[PDB]
Specification:
part of a larger assembly; 5 chains; A mainly alpha; B alpha/beta; C alpha+beta; D alpha+beta; C: alpha+beta; globular; D: 3-stranded mixed beta sheet; 5 strands; 13% strand; elongated; binds zinc ion
């Protein structure tokens, strides 16, 4: 027999990381992958996801074909597992990530990669800019405010103090880490879905700019 | 908890005032009546409301504050054949008994007397007071209601106060006596209990359990119930939403408002559902005379049948399935242009559709 | 939004009634002077500044004991030579309208007084006049309702406890001259009854009793009464004869060579009057 | 590093020399600066939360962004954040002058990766484009409320010197959500500032490469304006060099 | 009108003459961007 609960927990954590649904970062290992796959196999509920991932053992550079019922079942299973919302885009992201992991060899060191192979034609940032901007200009403003107005600043100093107390035990370091990684992962997902190369250089140039402004 | 058969307990709202007439000398084994009477009261002040002159049958009368004698097990209290023993509204276990049968009169029915063998319950026609929670009130020292008796039987707006160090059982007894006085009032009286909400809730719970004990002993049901604070808050919210002035609308009438819906639509009003839920935290079912079915929180149920029909009564697989649920939910999302806050549930059915 | 649905927050609260005074003329900005003491959650519902300004009274503490209990007490600010109306430390409901110059002070404070003193007719008159005065609807109405609600909230907090204290058995107080063989005491208890519940609470917080019987022990803080109560109200008068000298050293060489650091007895005149009784400590 | 002091009496030659290691004062200074910066950032975050409350929207932030129908509240929140950042850079400004338009995209072919909030004029007035799906995704991504983030000598010294102390729906998760939204709107505001003050071509070039931000901003930001929120920490991509080589 | 009470904005007879007269809020947000206007008043 197996500790299906522990297997499930490891599976959930690994799936979260490989679907970029959690900013949490931790070590992972072949033990964890095996936990995940065994849990999926044993669970009647998740047989479809098990089949999906098992198919990654092959060339894995392919788009699985599913009926609408199959896709709905898979999405329901994933959403029940992670308790969230989700998307077949996330399904494909997990498929690609797990395929890369399975195809990767056993190594003495962890492999750090970037999301890719999600949703054929490679598009540049410039082409995306042109097309998206044209479509946006086509779009019309859903709502607007008039000129001037006034920022609605709060006034209750006691209220501000209460909020300050409520937030004091929150570590700014952890909050900053979580926020930055959230933004980074969402940008990664957008790029991968768009099939446009992610400019790691410019993404880091953002922080370079932050530092260059700070130093002055 | 065990009680000695030698004690006989009479429960009556009237006992908020001591029943002097009902006292009678007890006889010994020799059938010699005892001319000495000992009256036990929960508090010293109570003594002032015992008129020794109202005991012609006896030659000597003494009154004392009953106090828990830790040195005597209530399972077998000491006997004093030299005097006839009467307890009035006892709050602690009786550790002493008199000749013959030790008499007890109480407006309360605590566990101590609950297991008492001889239980005489006086029945009264209910007459409910008015809860008037609100910050021209007449203050009442609940510890000594009989002092305020005249006001209690005349006025109709009372502020119920307690001494800081008053005990919980003393509070309970005072409230019970005051409610008995209101039960005899021709005109219901509004009152406000100057106590914390949690304390008032606990007192109400204990009073409800006491009433339950009286019923189990054969007391007549009384609609003169009480409402927990959460239920009162919910009723106030409902009245405000409907635009009903709280001072204008009473909770009882507010609830009765939906009796017009209860039967004709064969539905349980949501107000009653919420009140029942509050009481449960501290299911519903009803019918009409000659009615063949019962209206319940679960819906229609055949009379005397369980609150739920057999599991296989109805097959919901056609629509109670992920495919249908997702289809309907997606259709709703598309048609309404929504992205969140939408939730569709298959409709189950009880005995009847 | 940030806060939980409703979830009444917890913070400090200014307690002196007069803190709510604001100019009904929104175009005229006004700030009332409040002593910081107002933010202490104590029996006082008036700050030191308002107390001194309107009642001629200053707060003070009286240690009591093994466990040092601190009993609230006020003291005279009345000078020796003040006479007549000046001696009214706290006017009665039949004299406050005159003692306090309603005309000379703000309408909001006049409403506050007609609320504290149970003068519903005056309160209604002020409300109607404000209804028909100035841009009532725009913001003056809301300001008036806010002030009235604050005053009524304070009064509703006080009066129930005051009534419970009145009917209380364990705690008993008798505001009169303990020297029953005196004529300036009178039916002090009756007059105290005539006072409003909130006013009664203020009197309790201010005037200490000449004697105090705790359970079986009696402590005599004075062999005499430092103030009296009559129809006019609380009067800063000596019941037996000449007024007590009140230097008022503040607020409104060989001698010192010998009198260097050296214990000094204050010249203040605290408020001692009547009998008080209590069972247990209740503290 | 270190210093030393010498005490001596004028008439005497007996001198007493003491040595001081500046590391202690360095620790004092670093702790003071860290505490001050933390306080400033928490104050700003609380102020932002408070003004959003002042807007008095019933739902919480994430629910608001999930409710696609109520574009009104999305626009209100976005504009309020943008104005707050604008004022934080120009405290004397409490409005935004020119009226503002808003649109909420709903599709990938309508959204631009890496710039969920962007700006474009209709030749008469500026319109702000919002990627509500992306906002929802960011604010919904599960956050880590457990793991910590980070010279060992000074680390230990701070550990042993500094102390620790053992009715709002806000948890660290919601605080993180608010911070993420603020940072995103700050990035968008920088883009918009470069746009307004350097032309649409410069705005497009910045979008292509943010590096221009360095000069185009530090010319005015680092000198007159409160430092960027990100300035609180130095950020870097894990395994940046190998990733670049990839 | 002028009488003992003083000057009154009343009429000599009949009924009275008709005499009619930023803190960014959620409501202050306007919806999508999209009758004798030509005559003086
Ligand atoms: Zn004040």
């Amino acid at each position: 027999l197996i500790n299906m609960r522990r297997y499930r927990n490891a599976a959930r954590k690994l799936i979260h990381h490989y679907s970029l649904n959690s900013t949490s970062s931790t070590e992972y290992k072949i033990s964890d992958v095996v936990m995940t796959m065994i849990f999926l196999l044993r669970s009647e509920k998740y047989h479809s996801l098990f089949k999906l991932l098992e198919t990654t053992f092959d060339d894995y550079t392919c788009r699985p074909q599913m009926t609408q019922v199959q896709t709905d079942t898979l999405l329901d299973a994933v959403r029940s597992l992670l308790e969230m919302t989700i998307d077949l885009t996330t399904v494909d992201i997990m498929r690609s990530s797990f395929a890369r992991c399975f195809n990767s060899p056993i190594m003495r060191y962890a492999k750090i990669v970037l999301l890719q192979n999600v949703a054929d034609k490679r598009t540049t940032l410039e082409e995306l800019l042109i097309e998206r901007g044209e479509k946006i200009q086509m779009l019309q403003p859903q709502q607007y405010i008039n000129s001037g107005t006034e920022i609605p600043f709060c006034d209750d100093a006691e209220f501000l103090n209460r909020l300050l107390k409520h937030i004091d035990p929150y570590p700014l370091s952890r909050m900053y880490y979580n926020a930055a990684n959230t933004m980074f992962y969402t940008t990664m997902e957008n790029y991968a879905v768009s099939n446009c190369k992610f400019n790691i250089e410019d993404y880091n140039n953002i922080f370079k700019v932050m530092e260059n402004i700070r130093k002055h | 908890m065990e009680c000695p058969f030698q004690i006989q307990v009479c429960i009556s709202d009237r006992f908020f005032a001591f029943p002097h007439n009902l006292v009678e000398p007890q006889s010994d084994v020799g059938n010699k009546l005892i001319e000495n009477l000992i009256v036990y009261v929960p508090t010293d002040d109570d003594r002032l409301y015992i008129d020794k002159k109202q005991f012609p049958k006896f030659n000597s009368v003494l009154v004392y504050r009953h106090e828990h004698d830790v040195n005597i097990d209530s399972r077998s209290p000491k006997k004093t054949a030299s005097a006839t023993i009467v307890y009035w509204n006892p709050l602690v276990p009786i550790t002493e008994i008199g000749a013959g049968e030790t008499r007890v009169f109480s407006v309360l029915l605590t566990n101590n007397l609950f297991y008492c063998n001889t239980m005489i319950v006086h029945h009264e026609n209910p007459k409910c007071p008015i809860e008037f929670t609100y910050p021209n009130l007449r203050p009442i020292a609940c510890e000594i209601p009989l002092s305020h008796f005249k006001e209690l039987v005349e006025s109709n707006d009372f502020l119920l106060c307690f001494n800081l160090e008053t005990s919980t059982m003393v509070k309970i007894l005072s409230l019970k006596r005051i409610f008995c006085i209101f039960q005899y009032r021709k005109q219901p009286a509004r009152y406000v209990i100057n106590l914390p909400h949690e304390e008032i809730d606990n007192l109400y719970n204990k009073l409800n359990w006491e009433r339950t004990r009286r019923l189990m002993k054969g007391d007549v049901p009384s609609n003169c119930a009480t409402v927990n604070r959460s239920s009162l808050k919910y009723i106030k919210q409902a009245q405000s939403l409907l635009g009903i002035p709280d001072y204008s609308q009473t909770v009882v009438d507010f609830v009765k408002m939906f009796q017009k819906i209860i039967f004709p639509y064969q539905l349980v009003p949501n107000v009653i559902i919420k009140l029942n839920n509050f009481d449960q935290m501290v299911k519903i079912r009803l019918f009409c005379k000659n009615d063949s079915i019962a209206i319940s929180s679960s819906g229609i149920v055949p009379i005397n049948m369980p609150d739920f029909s057999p599991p296989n009564t109805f097959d919901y697989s056609d629509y109670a399935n992920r495919t249908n649920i997702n289809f309907v939910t997606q259709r709703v999302l598309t048609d309404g242009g929504f992205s969140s806050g939408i939730t569709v549930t298959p409709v189950k059915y009880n005995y009847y559709l | 939004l940030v806060p939980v649905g409703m979830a009444p927050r917890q913070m400090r609260v200014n307690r002196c009634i007069f803190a709510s005074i604001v100019s009904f003329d929104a175009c005229i900005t006004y700030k009332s002077p409040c002593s910081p003491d107002a933010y202490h959650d104590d029996g006082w519902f008036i700050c030191n500044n308002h107390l001194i300004k309107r009642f001629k009274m200053s707060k003070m503490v009286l240690p009591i004991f093994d466990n040092q209990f601190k009993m609230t007490i006020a003291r005279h600010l009345v000078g020796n030579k003040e006479r007549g109306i000046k001696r009214i430390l706290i006017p009665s409901a039949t004299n406050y309208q005159d003692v306090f110059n309603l005309n000379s002070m703000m309408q909001a404070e006049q409403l506050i007084f007609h609320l504290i003193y149970n003068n519903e007719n005056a309160v209604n008159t002020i409300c109607d006049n404000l209804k028909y005065t100035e841009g009532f609807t725009s913001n003056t109405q809301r300001v008036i309702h806010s002030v009235y609600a604050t005053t009524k909230s304070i009064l509703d907090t006080t009066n129930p406890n005051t009534f419970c204290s009145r009917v209380s058995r364990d705690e008993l107080r008798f505001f009169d001259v303990t020297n029953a063989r005196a004529l300036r005491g009178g039916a002090g208890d009756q007059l105290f009854n005539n006072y409003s519940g909130f006013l009664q609470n203020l009197i309790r917080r201010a005037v200490a009793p000449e004697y105090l019987q705790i359970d079986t022990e009696e402590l005599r803080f004075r062999n005499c009464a430092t103030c009296i109560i009559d129809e006019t109200g609380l009067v800063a008068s000596v019941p037996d004869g000449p007024e007590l000298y009140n230097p008022i050293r503040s607020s409104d060489r060989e001698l010192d060579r010998t009198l260097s650091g050296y214990e000094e007895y204050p010249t203040y005149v605290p408020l001692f009057l009547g009998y008080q009784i209590i069972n247990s400590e209740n503290n | 590093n270190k210093v030393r002091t010498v005490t001596e009496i004028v008439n005497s030659d007996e001198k007493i020399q003491k040595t001081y290691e500046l590391a202690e004062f360095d620790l004092k200074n670093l702790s003071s600066l860290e505490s001050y910066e933390t306080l400033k950032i928490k104050l700003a975050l609380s102020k932002y939360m408070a003004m959003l409350s002042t807007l008095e929207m019933t739902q919480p932030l994430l629910e608001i962004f999930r409710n696609k129908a109520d574009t009104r509240q999305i626009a209100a929140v976005v504009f309020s954040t943008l104005a707050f950042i604008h004022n934080r850079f120009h405290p004397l400004v409490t409005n935004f002058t020119n009226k503002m338009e808003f649109v909420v995209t709903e599709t990938n072919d309508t959204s631009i990766p890496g710039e969920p909030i962007l700006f474009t004029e209709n030749e008469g007035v500026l319109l702000c484009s919002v990627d509500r799906p992306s906002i929802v995704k960011m604010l919904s991504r599960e956050f880590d409320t457990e793991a910590l983030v980070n010279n060992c000598n000074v680390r230990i010294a701070k550990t042993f010197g500094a102390s620790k102390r053992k009715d709002f729906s806000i948890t660290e998760v919601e605080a993180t959500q608010y911070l993420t939204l603020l940072l995103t709107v700050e990035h968008a505001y920088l883009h918009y500032y470069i746009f307004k003050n350097y032309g649409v071509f410069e705005y497009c070039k910045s979008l292509t490469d943010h590096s221009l931000f360095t000069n185009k901003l530090r010319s005015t930001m680092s000198t007159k304006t409160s430092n960027l929120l990100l300035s609180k920490f130095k950020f870097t991509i894990e395994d940046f060099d190998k990733i670049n080589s990839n | 009108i002028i009488d003992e009470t003083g000057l009154v904005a009343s009429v000599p007879d009949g009924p009275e003459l008709y005499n009619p007269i930023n803190r960014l809020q959620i409501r202050n947000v306007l919806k999508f961007e999209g009758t004798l206007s030509g005559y003086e008043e």
